[PDB]
Write a protein that binds this ligand. Structure first.
Ligand SMILES: Nc1nc2c(ncn2[C@@H]2O[C@@H]3COP(=O)(O)O[C@H]4[C@@H](O)[C@H](n5cnc6c(=O)[nH]c(N)nc65)O[C@@H]4COP(=O)(O)O[C@H]3[C@H]2O)c(=O)[nH]1
Ligand SMILES: Nc1nc2c(ncn2[C@@H]2O[C@@H]3COP(=O)(O)O[C@H]4[C@@H](O)[C@H](n5cnc6c(=O)[nH]c(N)nc65)O[C@@H]4COP(=O)(O)O[C@H]3[C@H]2O)c(=O)[nH]1
Length: 85
């Protein structure tokens, strides 16, 4: 029954989410796998599915990677994102 290719573990960090038209905001992750991340913020919950956002974790010693992510789903609290190839 498990349809996840990779397991998810809790991870909470500050992440900047940006989109060319919708603008940017600072959110927090909730959980992570090798293929995707859930990002919690009320203002993300109306992103269309298929939106492509960039995310970059904040406040790391090193500059974090800037990741392209697809919005695969929204819920009451945020969005499920999949990292792009
Ligand atoms: N479309 C979509 N929705 C997603 C995805 N991941 C989470 N959700 C949504 O978020 C709810 C809560 O997920 P959860 O806390 O991981 O809590 C999950 C998790 O513990 C487990 N679960 C369900 N399906 C899977 C699965 O394929 N693999 C694993 N490992 N757990 C699953 O059952 C709980 C309840 O599942 P749901 O009733 O389905 O309720 C899910 C579903 O509505 C996803 O990749 N795609
Ligand atoms: N960390 C994280 N990543 C997320 C979340 N929601 C989506 N993703 C990412 O987006 C991918 C594709 O999600 P999907 O198209 O809904 O495709 C999902 C969905 O159809 C199903 N699925 C997995 N978990 C659940 C679940 O809890 N409930 C339901 N209903 N479906 C699930 O299995 C497919 C493949 O799941 P994955 O291989 O995990 O692949 C997931 C994962 O990399 C989330 O809450 N947290």
């Amino acid at each position: 029954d498990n349809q996840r290719q990779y397991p998810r573990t809790p991870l909470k960090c500050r992440i900047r989410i940006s989109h060319p038209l919708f603008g940017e905001l600072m959110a927090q992750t909730r959980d992570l796998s090798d293929t995707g991340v859930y990002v919690k913020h009320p203002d993300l919950t109306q992103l269309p599915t298929g939106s492509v956002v960039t995310g970059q974790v904040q406040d790391l010693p090193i500059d974090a990677p800037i990741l392209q992510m697809e919005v695969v789903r929204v819920d009451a609290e945020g969005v499920g994102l999949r990292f792009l190839s």
